[PDB]
Amino acid sequence: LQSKWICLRLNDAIIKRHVLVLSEYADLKYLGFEKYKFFEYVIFQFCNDPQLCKIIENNYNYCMQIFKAPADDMRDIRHNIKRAFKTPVLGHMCVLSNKPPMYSFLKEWFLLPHYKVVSLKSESLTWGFPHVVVFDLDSTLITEEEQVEIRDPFVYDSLQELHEMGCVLVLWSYGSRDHVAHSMRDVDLEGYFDIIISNAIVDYNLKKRFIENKFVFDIHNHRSDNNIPKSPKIVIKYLSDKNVNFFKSITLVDDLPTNNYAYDFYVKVKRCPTPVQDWEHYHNEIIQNIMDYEQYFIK
Amino acid sequence: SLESYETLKIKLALSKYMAMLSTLEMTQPLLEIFRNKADTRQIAAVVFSTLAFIHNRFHPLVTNFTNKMEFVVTETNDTSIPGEPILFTENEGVLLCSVDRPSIVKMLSREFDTEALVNFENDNCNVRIAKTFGAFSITEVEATQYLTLLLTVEHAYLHYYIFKNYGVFEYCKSLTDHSLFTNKLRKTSNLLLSKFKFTIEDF
C-alpha cells in the first residue's frame, strides 16, 4: 500500500507545528489570504505530475519534500514529515472541512476543521511539548482479580517520574465509568491521571472525571474490537479539551496488543490477575520507547 | 525545621544570585542602577545575567544560553505594558528585550513592611539568656528588593521560554493569558515562583 505523497513546510508561518490535509495542491485557493499562514505544514497525496512538482517548487513560500507511506496510518506519515523537517512535535491536526480530503491514511486518527486553528488555546498544562501515554487500567496497572490492586506499587513512582519529566497521563479502560472510578479510588491513584476514559460523572465523590463518551461513529470499515481498538482521535480530542494541542509522541500501554489503533509506540503487559513485581520492567520499556523517540529527534 | 531547611535552600539560591551580582561587580545598588537611566548597559547586563542564571537553574543540565540579545530600556508609558515590565519582541529576526525602567524603579522604591509585620520565628528567651550569660552586609529591605527583581525576571524568563519553545504567537497569547503556568513545575523547582502562592480577592 506504499503511496507517494508531497509535504510542504511554510517558510514563514504564524502558527507552528500544525499540519493541514489537502486532497490536492490546488486546495490552497480555499485558504486564499491570511489562512495559509496558520498551517506551516501541508500534506497531500501525490498524483505523479511533474508539472505539479514544478509549480510547487516555484511556490517559493514552501519547502517541498516527497515521501511514500502505506495508505492506512498517520504513524508513518507523521514519522516521515517529522524526520523530513526535524520536528519532534506535532500540533493539532487540521483538515479542509469545505473539501474533506478522503485519505484512508487517517481512518480515525485525528483531525480538525481548519478554520478552528485561531480559536485554539495555546496555553496548556505542562511546559514544553510533553509526551502522552494511555493506560488500559484493567489488568495493566491493577490486578484482574475482583479485589483489584496495583500489580506493582512501583506504578506510583513510574507515574511520578512521567509527571516530573513532563508527560500527559491518560487512562482508557473498557469498563463501566463507575467501575474505573471506584478502581481509582480503591488503588489511590486518582489525581495521578490527567484524563480518564471508560457531563462526565457525578457521584458526590467526583466532580468531572469520565468525559461522556458522546462521540459515536461505529467503525471505519474495519471489523475489530466491538467498541474500538482504542481511539487516537478521541484521546487527542480530550487532550485539546485539556488544552493540550501539542505533543511529542503518544504511547499506548495496555494488556491487549489487539487494540493498538495507531500510536507512536505501544507496550504490552501481562493479563495478570494477581500482584507481581513487573511494572518496573514495564516502566523501563516505556521510558526506553520515550528515549528512542528522543534519539530519533536527538539532533 | 524541615520547612526551615527549604528556607535555607531558598536563601542559598538568593545568595547564588548575589554571587552573580558580585560577578557583575556593580558599584551601586540595583535601586540606584535602575534609577540612573544613563546606566543602560548596566541595566541590560543585569537583566541578561539574571536571565542566564534563571536558565541555568531551570535547565541544570543545560549551560548554554543566548550570548547576544538586543536590548531597549523603555521609559514612556506607551512603551510599557502593565503587568509585564519586561517584554521579548522580534524585529523580523532580531530579538528585542524591552525593559520598563520606571516600573522597576517604582517597585524597588516602594517601602517594605519589614518591621511593620510580626511573624513566627525561632524565638526562645531561655536560649537568649543562656547566650547572654555565656558571653559588607545586606539589609532585609535590600534582600526584599533583590528577591522582587529576581522574581520579576523569572516571570520574564518564563515568557521568554514560551516565546523560544513555542513561538512569538504563543508568547503573545501567554502575555494575554497566563494560565499556562498555573501548574508551573511539571527544572521549574529551581524557580522561586514555584515556591509560594499569591492571590487577590474581592473586598
Partner: peptide, 22 residues
Amino acid sequence: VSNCKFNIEDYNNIFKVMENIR
C-alpha cells in the same frame, strides 16, 4: 494609568501553584 481593564483571575494564575498528591 493606561485605563486598561485588569484580569484578576489571570494575575492569580500568574502566581498560582498546583499541589501534587505526594
